[PDB]
Model the fold of this input.
Amino acid sequence: MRRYEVNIVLNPNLDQSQLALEKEIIQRALENYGARVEKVEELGLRRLAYPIAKDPQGYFLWYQVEMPEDRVNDAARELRIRDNVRRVMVVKSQEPF
Done:
């Protein structure tokens, strides 16, 4: 297994209720692909490098996970289908918590 950082940007107009749901779905998907979720951070609202879905900002979520490298891409695709997920970026962990 390898340790990765998953950066997710969500629709910025969700209320705390919808937000919590998206988080559970993300967690379940990562775990269904063999991931051990080590740390989860809610970063909040940021101005995006470029607008997505016509929105100039997004709600950021960060995850540190350990999972099979052969499943990373499949997991990322799964995450990208959700309508409220605007952007997904997976990088190899360099300085883990």
Observations:
- The longest helix spans residues 16-32.
- Residues 1-97 form a domain with the Alpha-Beta Plaits fold (CATH 3.30.70.60).
